[PDB]
């Protein structure tokens, strides 16, 4: 797993990157009230979203990540704060079923699907993890991002290159940390995303623009967020059965 070489550097990135405040805001806007809900946090990392979701009143939270190192960090955080989160080390595309939850949160899951086949498998895994009145809140790469139109390094993610990869694109990137933290991800088209959504049995979906606000524009130099607005690397996505 690539994040075995990243580990605690990823938290360092989430603490310094200008984009992270916007994405956290957008994800919790999509999620809404979590009181009493059962929650599955996929590609959970050290557990940031699942753990905050528990802090905001969720009844039960389970996290899944492919990286042993990130899950080791996730379990140590749960021990440090005595919380009841449970974690699994699994590739979500081929995950054993964990049952049906009220809410699946998937922040930076689908951009690790290395083929359209695996993108479609992940969406079927999510649907199988959802109650009939549940929902998926997801955060992923905006299909429309184009590296030539503006890099994201000033927002925390230095995208190093862009290569055709079958029907999509493959990016090598690094989080802006000390030292930089290398990772690779995939940019699948909007059509392929929506087909995976439809064929996984989600009859409703909505793309969500990141929630950049007046105060964010106020406290950076004018135009700082221009690339973020006209070449956004990130998008929200809400799906319901
Ligand atoms: N196929 C897969 N299944 C599960 N987790 C995966 C995966 N591919 C990548 N990941 C994990 O996805 C994470 C992306 S970083 C996002 C971490 C966390 N959701 C947060 O936002 O704070 C990494 O921890 C990585 O190990
Ligand atoms: O936390 C993140 N994980 C990612 O995989 C990612 N990919 C692109 N841009 N930002 C990201 N942020």
Compute the Cα dihedral for 76, 80, 81, 82 and give only its sign.
positive
Estimate to the nearest angstrom the gap between the alpha carbon of 15 and the chain centroid. 16
Distance between Cα 161 and ligand 2 center (Å): 15
Distance CA 164, CA 130 (A): 33
Residue 12 in tokens:
């360092």
Q: What is the CA radius of gyration of the chain?
A: 17
The method recorded for this entry reads X-ray
Residue 71 resides in a domain = yes
Distance CA 102, CA 146 (A): 35
Q: Which helix (H) or strand (E) holds 237?
A: strand 234-240
Residue 211 in tokens:
């929630």
Q: Which helix (H) or strand (E) holds 159?
A: strand 157-159
Count CB neighbours of 92 within 10 A.
24
Residue 28 resides in a domain = yes
User: Which residue intervals of the chain are DSSP H helices?
Assistant: 9-16, 18-31, 48-55, 68-81, 116-128, 190-199, 214-218, 226-230
Distance between Cα 51 and ligand 2 center (Å): 18
Position of tokens 């862009």? 162
Atom of ligand 2 nearest to the CA of 152: 9
Atom of ligand 2 nearest to the CA of 141: 8
For 51-102, give the secondary structure using H, E and C: HHHHHCCCCEEEEEECCHHHHHHHHHHHHHHCCCCEEEECCHHHCCCCCCEE
Residues 6+ apart with CB under 8 A from 45: 3, 10, 65, 70, 73, 74, 108
Residue 227 resides in a domain = yes
Longest dimension (CA), the chain: 48
CATH code of 69's domain: 3.40.50.150
Q: Which helix (H) or strand (E) holds 38?
A: strand 38-42
Distance CA 14, CA 21 (A): 9
Distance CA 194, CA 200 (A): 10
Q: Are strands 181-187 and 168-175 parallel, antiparallel or unpaired?
A: antiparallel
- Cβ atoms of 205 and 197 within 8 Å: the answer is yes
Nearest residue CA, atom 14 of ligand 1?
108
Q: Are strands 234-240 and 38-42 parallel, antiparallel or unpaired?
A: unpaired
Which ligand number lies closest to the CA of residue 13?
Answer: 2
| Backbone conformation region of residue 82, classed left if phi is above 0, alpha if psi is from -120 to 50, else beta | left
Residues 6+ apart with CB under 8 A from 15: none
Residue 1 resides in a domain = no
Residue 3 resides in a domain = no
Residue 175 resides in a domain = yes
What is the three-class DSSP state of 231?
A: coil
- Cβ atoms of 70 and 49 within 8 Å: the answer is no
Distance CA 224, CA 219 (A): 10
Is the distance from the beta carbon of residue 157 to the nearest atom of ligand 1 less than 6 Å? no
Distance CA 204, CA 41 (A): 20
Distance CA 213, CA 211 (A): 6
Distance CA 232, CA 223 (A): 14
Distance CA 180, CA 150 (A): 19
- Cβ atoms of 110 and 119 within 8 Å: the answer is yes
Residues 6+ apart with CB under 8 A from 96: 90
Residue 65 resides in a domain = yes
Count CB neighbours of 64 within 10 A.
26
Q: How many domains does the chain have?
A: 1
Ligand 2 binding residues, C-beta < 6 A: 108, 111, 141, 157, 185, 233-234
Q: Is 65 annotated as a binding residue?
A: yes
Residue 183 resides in a domain = yes
Distance CA 72, CA 76 (A): 6
- Cβ atoms of 139 and 124 within 8 Å: the answer is no
Taking CA atoms, 206 is separated from 94, 115, 193, in Å, by 25, 22, 11
Full domain range(s) for residue 169: 8-240
Position of tokens 């993890």? 129
Distance CA 197, CA 15 (A): 32
Helices 116-128, 190-199: axis angle to 10 degrees equals 40
Is the distance from the beta carbon of residue 91 to the nearest atom of ligand 1 less than 6 Å? yes
Cis status of the peptide bond prior to 179, with omega within 30 of 0? yes
- Cβ atoms of 171 and 142 within 8 Å: the answer is no
């Amino acid at each position: 797993a690539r994040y075995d070489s990243i580990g605690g550097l990823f938290e360092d990135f989430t603490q310094s990157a200008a984009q992270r405040a916007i994405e956290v805001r957008t994800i919790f806007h999509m999620i809404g009230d979590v009181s009493g809900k059962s929650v599955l946090d996929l590609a959970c990392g050290f557990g940031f979203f699942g753990r905050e979701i528990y802090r905001r009143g969720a009844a039960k939270v389970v996290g899944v990540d492919i990286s042993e190192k990130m899950i080791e960090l996730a379990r140590e955080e749960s021990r440090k704060y005595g919380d009841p989160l449970e974690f699994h080390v699994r590739d979500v595309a081929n995950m054993e079923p964990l049952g049906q939850f009220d809410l699946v949160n998937a922040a930076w899951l689908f951009n690790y699907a290395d083929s359209v086949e695996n993108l479609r498998k992940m969406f079927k895994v999510v649907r199988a993890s959802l109650k009939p009145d549940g929902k998926l809140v997801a955060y992923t790469v905006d299909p429309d991002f184009s590296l030539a139109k503006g890099n994201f390094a000033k927002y925390g993610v230095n995208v190093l290159n862009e290569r055709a990869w079958g029907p999509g694109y493959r990016h090598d990137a690094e989080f802006v940390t000390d030292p930089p933290s290398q990772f690779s991800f995939y940019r699948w088209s909007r059509a392929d995303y929506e087909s995976a959504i439809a064929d996984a049995g989600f009859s409703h979906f909505e793309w969500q623009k990141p929630l950049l606000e007046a105060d964010d524009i106020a406290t950076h130099p004018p135009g700082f967020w221009d690339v973020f607005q006209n070449n956004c690397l990130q998008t929200g996505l809400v799906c319901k059965p």
